[PDB]
Symmetry: C3
Subunit: 32 residues, 3 copies
């Protein structure tokens, strides 16, 4: 496929990991 | 690549931005 | 496009649904 498609997938995976880190910080503060 | 692949990427980016908005609202209510 | 691209999209959609479940559990505990 497109190199642009693969580039977008890279950005998406980075965004998701950043979101999962944010959710981990929230669950740690509130307990779950 | 597929127009269907690019369509799915559009839906994913919309879902991610919606999630980031939800996380912003949570962090604003609890402080972080 | 690539079968690998479509496989990555499958993993991304699973990650997003899992994240949306986690956000639902957080909003239920704190109220919003």
């Amino acid at each position: 496929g497109m190199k642009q498609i693969e580039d977008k997938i890279e950005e998406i995976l980075s965004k998701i990991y950043h979101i999962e880190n944010e959710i981990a910080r929230i669950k740690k503060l509130i307990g779950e």
